[PDB]
Amino acid sequence: GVEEKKSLEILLKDDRLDTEKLCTFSQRFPLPSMYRALVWKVLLGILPPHHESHAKVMMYRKEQYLDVLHALKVVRFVSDATPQAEVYLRMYQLESGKLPRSPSFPLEPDDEVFLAIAKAMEEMVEDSVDCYWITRRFVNQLNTKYRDSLPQLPKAFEQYLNLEDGRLLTHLRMCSAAPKLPYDLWFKRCFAGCLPESSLQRVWDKVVSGSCKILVFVAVEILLTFKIKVMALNSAEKITKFLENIPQDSSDAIVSKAIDLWHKHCGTPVHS
Numbered sequence: 001g002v003e004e005k006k007s008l009e010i011l012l013k014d015d016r017l018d019t020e021k022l023c024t025f026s027q028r029f030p031l032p033s034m035y036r037a038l039v040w041k042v043l044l045g046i047l048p049p050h051h052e053s054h055a056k057v058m059m060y061r062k063e064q065y066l067d068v069l070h071a072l073k074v075v076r077f078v079s080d081a082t083p084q085a086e087v088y089l090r091m092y093q094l095e096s097g098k099l100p101r102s103p104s105f106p107l108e109p110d111d112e113v114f115l116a117i118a119k120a121m122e123e124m125v126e127d128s129v130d131c132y133w134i135t136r137r138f139v140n141q142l143n144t145k146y147r148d149s150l151p152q153l154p155k156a157f158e159q160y161l162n163l164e165d166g167r168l169l170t171h172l173r174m175c176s177a178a179p180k181l182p183y184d185l186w187f188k189r190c191f192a193g194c195l196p197e198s199s200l201q202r203v204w205d206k207v208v209s210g211s212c213k214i215l216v217f218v219a220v221e222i223l224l225t226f227k228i229k230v231m232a233l234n235s236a237e238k239i240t241k242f243l244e245n246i247p248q249d250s251s252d253a254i255v256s257k258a259i260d261l262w263h264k265h266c267g268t269p270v271h272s
Helices: 002-011 019-028 033-043 051-074 084-096 109-122 128-143 150-164 166-174 183-187 197-208 214-225 227-232 236-243 251-266
Strands: none
Touching: 002 019, 002 033, 019 033, 019 197, 033 128, 033 197, 051 084, 051 128, 084 109, 084 128, 109 128, 128 197, 150 166, 150 183, 150 214, 150 251, 166 227, 183 214, 197 214, 197 251, 214 227, 214 251, 227 236
C-alpha cells in the first residue's frame, strides 16, 4: 500500500485527473482511505476531472442538499432525531418524486436497498453532502449501468462456486439451497449490512470503478471461507440464515481473497 499510494498521488498531481487510469488503479489496488471520497466522486461523475473546479461543484451540491433537507423539514417528513440514513432516503425520494403519503408508510423493496446502502456509506464517507451524493450515484449505477448484469450474478455465482469447490455446491444443491440463498443481500445491497464497512469499502472500490462481477467472487469467497460450517447445516433455511449473519472477524481476508479470485477468473488488466 505504501508504493500504491505514491503512484495514486502522482495521478492526483494532474490539473486534469486521468479518469481512465483512476479506474484501472482502483480495479487493481485498494484506494487509500484519504483519497477514496475524492476518487469515488470523480469516478461517479459527481466531480469533474479538473480539480480546480471541485470546491465549486461541491458548493452547488451542498446548496441543493440543504434545499431538499429544508423542504423535508417544512413538510414534517423528517425531524432532528430522524436517523441520517433515513434522511438520505427521504431526500432521494423527494428529489425523484416518489415521496410516500407519510413517514409511517411501509418501505418498498428498492427503499430498503437504498436504506441499507446509505447506512453502510455513512460509515465510509465522513462528510454528509459527500455521503448523500455518493449514495445516490452508487445506487443509480446499480439501477442503470448494471441493471441487466445484476440479475445474471446468481448464475455466475453458481458457475464460479462450481469451479472453486463443486463439493460445496453439490451440498447446497442436494438441499435445494441455491434458489433460497440471499442473492438480494449480495447483488442488490452489494453486501451492505453483511460485511463491516472497513472491508466493504474495498469491495465497493471495484464496484465504483466499473465491476459488478466482484460481487460474485465475494459471495463465492464467503462460502469457501465458511465451508465447514455450511456443510454441517442440513436444510435450506439454516444455510440462508447463517449467510445473512456471517461472523465478521475474517472479513478483511474474505475481501482480499475475493479480489484475487476475480482477477484470476476475469483477467482484470494490470494498471500502468
